[PDB]
Design an enzyme around this catalytic site. Structure first.
Site, mmCIF file in Angstrom:
data_model
loop_
_atom_site.group_PDB
_atom_site.id
_atom_site.type_symbol
_atom_site.label_atom_id
_atom_site.label_comp_id
_atom_site.label_asym_id
_atom_site.label_seq_id
_atom_site.Cartn_x
_atom_site.Cartn_y
_atom_site.Cartn_z
ATOM 1 N N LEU A 159 0.800 -1.216 0.000
ATOM 2 C CA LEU A 159 0.000 0.000 0.000
ATOM 3 C C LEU A 159 0.834 1.268 0.000
ATOM 4 O O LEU A 159 0.403 2.285 -0.553
ATOM 5 C CB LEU A 159 -0.931 0.029 1.216
ATOM 6 C CG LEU A 159 -1.596 -1.287 1.590
ATOM 7 C CD1 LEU A 159 -2.193 -1.189 2.989
ATOM 8 C CD2 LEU A 159 -2.650 -1.613 0.567
ATOM 9 N N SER A 167 5.329 2.574 0.359
ATOM 10 C CA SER A 167 6.736 2.313 0.636
ATOM 11 C C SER A 167 7.342 3.618 1.115
ATOM 12 O O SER A 167 7.696 4.471 0.294
ATOM 13 C CB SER A 167 7.475 1.800 -0.601
ATOM 14 O OG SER A 167 8.856 1.594 -0.327
ATOM 15 N N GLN A 201 10.602 5.357 3.219
ATOM 16 C CA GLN A 201 12.006 5.000 3.353
ATOM 17 C C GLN A 201 12.159 4.215 4.649
ATOM 18 O O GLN A 201 11.663 4.639 5.704
ATOM 19 C CB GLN A 201 12.907 6.235 3.351
ATOM 20 C CG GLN A 201 14.386 5.874 3.209
ATOM 21 C CD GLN A 201 15.329 7.019 3.513
ATOM 22 O OE1 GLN A 201 14.949 8.000 4.153
ATOM 23 N NE2 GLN A 201 16.572 6.897 3.051
ATOM 24 N N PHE A 202 12.777 3.038 4.551
ATOM 25 C CA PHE A 202 12.930 2.128 5.678
ATOM 26 C C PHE A 202 11.602 1.565 6.165
ATOM 27 O O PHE A 202 11.566 0.917 7.216
ATOM 28 C CB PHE A 202 13.670 2.799 6.847
ATOM 29 C CG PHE A 202 15.011 3.350 6.476
ATOM 30 C CD1 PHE A 202 15.396 4.622 6.874
ATOM 31 C CD2 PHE A 202 15.879 2.601 5.704
ATOM 32 C CE1 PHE A 202 16.640 5.123 6.529
ATOM 33 C CE2 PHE A 202 17.118 3.097 5.343
ATOM 34 C CZ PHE A 202 17.501 4.357 5.759
ATOM 35 N N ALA A 203 10.509 1.778 5.425
ATOM 36 C CA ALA A 203 9.217 1.217 5.798
ATOM 37 C C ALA A 203 8.458 0.760 4.558
ATOM 38 O O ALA A 203 8.433 1.460 3.543
ATOM 39 C CB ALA A 203 8.385 2.240 6.581
ATOM 40 N N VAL A 246 4.456 -0.868 3.709
ATOM 41 C CA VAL A 246 3.107 -1.110 4.212
ATOM 42 C C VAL A 246 2.410 -2.119 3.303
ATOM 43 O O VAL A 246 2.241 -1.874 2.102
ATOM 44 C CB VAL A 246 2.296 0.191 4.295
ATOM 45 C CG1 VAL A 246 0.946 -0.069 4.976
ATOM 46 C CG2 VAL A 246 3.094 1.248 5.024
ATOM 47 N N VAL A 305 -6.848 1.842 6.194
ATOM 48 C CA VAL A 305 -7.447 3.037 5.636
ATOM 49 C C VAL A 305 -7.429 2.828 4.132
ATOM 50 O O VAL A 305 -6.370 2.846 3.496
ATOM 51 C CB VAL A 305 -6.690 4.300 6.074
ATOM 52 C CG1 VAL A 305 -7.504 5.498 5.822
ATOM 53 C CG2 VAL A 305 -6.385 4.209 7.560
ATOM 54 N N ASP A 363 4.671 16.069 10.024
ATOM 55 C CA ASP A 363 4.681 15.596 8.646
ATOM 56 C C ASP A 363 3.317 15.718 7.984
ATOM 57 O O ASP A 363 2.930 14.855 7.212
ATOM 58 C CB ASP A 363 5.179 14.163 8.560
ATOM 59 C CG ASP A 363 5.769 13.852 7.216
ATOM 60 O OD1 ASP A 363 6.067 14.812 6.476
ATOM 61 O OD2 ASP A 363 5.922 12.655 6.905
ATOM 62 N N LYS A 387 0.869 16.646 5.264
ATOM 63 C CA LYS A 387 0.864 16.927 3.833
ATOM 64 C C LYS A 387 -0.208 16.044 3.192
ATOM 65 O O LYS A 387 -0.773 15.162 3.856
ATOM 66 C CB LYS A 387 2.258 16.687 3.217
ATOM 67 C CG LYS A 387 2.603 15.234 3.047
ATOM 68 C CD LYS A 387 4.063 15.021 3.216
ATOM 69 C CE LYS A 387 4.416 13.580 2.981
ATOM 70 N NZ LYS A 387 5.787 13.319 3.442
ATOM 71 N N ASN A 402 -0.617 12.219 3.585
ATOM 72 C CA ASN A 402 -0.976 11.652 4.869
ATOM 73 C C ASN A 402 -2.396 12.003 5.275
ATOM 74 O O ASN A 402 -2.779 11.790 6.426
ATOM 75 C CB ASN A 402 0.025 12.091 5.930
ATOM 76 C CG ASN A 402 1.370 11.422 5.761
ATOM 77 O OD1 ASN A 402 1.441 10.271 5.342
ATOM 78 N ND2 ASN A 402 2.449 12.140 6.090
ATOM 79 N N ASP A 414 0.642 8.365 9.286
ATOM 80 C CA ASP A 414 2.100 8.440 9.292
ATOM 81 C C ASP A 414 2.612 9.336 10.406
ATOM 82 O O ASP A 414 2.900 10.527 10.204
ATOM 83 C CB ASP A 414 2.647 8.893 7.945
ATOM 84 C CG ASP A 414 4.116 8.580 7.793
ATOM 85 O OD1 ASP A 414 4.671 7.890 8.669
ATOM 86 O OD2 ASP A 414 4.733 9.020 6.804
ATOM 87 N N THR A 456 8.846 17.162 4.173
ATOM 88 C CA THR A 456 8.714 17.447 2.759
ATOM 89 C C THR A 456 8.870 18.938 2.529
ATOM 90 O O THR A 456 8.040 19.713 3.014
ATOM 91 C CB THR A 456 7.378 16.962 2.247
ATOM 92 O OG1 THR A 456 7.273 15.557 2.517
ATOM 93 C CG2 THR A 456 7.265 17.207 0.758
#
Ligand code: NA
Length: 277
Positions: free
Chosen positions: A19, A21, A23-25, A27, A96, A139, A141, A144, A161, A180
């Site tokens: 769902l 990607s 960075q380092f994660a 879903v 979600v 964060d 934006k 999210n 997030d 961002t």
């Protein structure tokens, strides 16, 4: 909250499509075997060694997990469970599934300001709850801002997030936030102390894009974008803002303020006559 569940997640859930990607994660949607219920599974790579820059530090993981553990509000994503293997911390989160709010609005044939404020008011309701807990998202934006499900008459917004979320117990936090460029507040840009006020700036950017489809501070390079934020270099381009109400620009004007202490507060914006006339 240092010791999470150490069982094999595959024993309790089946996981399918990706769902998101980070960075380092990554879903992946998943289904709890025992109940039938579906969830998003966020896999956060541990860095494991302080010298490794492949992964997230435990401190960052624990911060997001304990902020999520604390919140429970209809406009905010729910944390269900947390697992940890030798490579990942896995966050089992409310699914979600309505996609991004802006994606959904892109398919509308028309959008009055009145319609726009009923979605924005949801965002404000969720931020108000966060700030009442002295929690900053940092964060905020469009990526999210999600819909639970589009196929509902008036859909419901979910803020997601919490990877940069911080409890502001001293009235500011001092650390570099890497968000961002288009949406971070000037004080993030200049590595100054940060507070709940930064979210209010981000909200002002979202409202702007939401009403014009143009990005206020977006430049031709990352540093120009940052220089625009810090200089507060934006304009109500008449090419995008001719039919936009004055009350709407006043709302935007009070959020896009460089001095955080002068920026409009969450509860002020809920009282703004653009929000409740
Ligand atoms: Na509500």
């Amino acid at each position: 909250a240092t010791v999470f569940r150490q069982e094999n997640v595959d024993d309790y859930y089946d996981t399918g499509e990706e769902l998101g990607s980070g960075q380092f994660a990554v879903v992946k949607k998943c289904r709890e075997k025992s109940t039938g219920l579906q969830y998003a599974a966020k896999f956060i790579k541990k860095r494991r060694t302080k010298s490794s820059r492949r992964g997230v530090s435990r401190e960052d993981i624990e911060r997001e997990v304990s902020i999520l553990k604390e919140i429970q509000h209809p406009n905010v994503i729910t944390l269900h469970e947390v697992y940890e293997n030798k490579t990942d911390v896995i966050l089992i989160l409310e699914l979600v599934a309505g996609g991004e709010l802006f994606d959904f609005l892109a398919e509308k044939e028309s959008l009055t300001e009145e319609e726009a404020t009923e979605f924005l008011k949801q965002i404000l309701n969720g931020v108000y709850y966060l700030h009442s807990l002295q929690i900053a998202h940092f964060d905020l934006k469009p990526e999210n801002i999600m819909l639970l499900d589009r196929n509902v008459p008036k859909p419901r917004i979910k803020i997601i997030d919490f990877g940069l979320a911080h409890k502001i117990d001293f009235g500011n936090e001092f650390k570099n936030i890497f968000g961002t460029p288009e949406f971070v507040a000037p004080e993030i840009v200049n590595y100054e102390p940060l507070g709940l006020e930064a979210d209010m700036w981000s909200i002002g950017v979202i409202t702007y894009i939401l009403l014009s489809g143009a990005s206020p501070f977006l430049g031709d390079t990352k540093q120009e974008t940052l220089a625009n934020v810090s200089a507060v270099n934006y304009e109500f381009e008449d090419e995008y803002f001719s039919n936009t109400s004055a009350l709407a620009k006043d709302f935007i004007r009070r959020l896009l303020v460089k001095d955080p202490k002068k920026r409009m507060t969450i509860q002020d914006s809920l009282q703004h006559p653009w929000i409740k006339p």
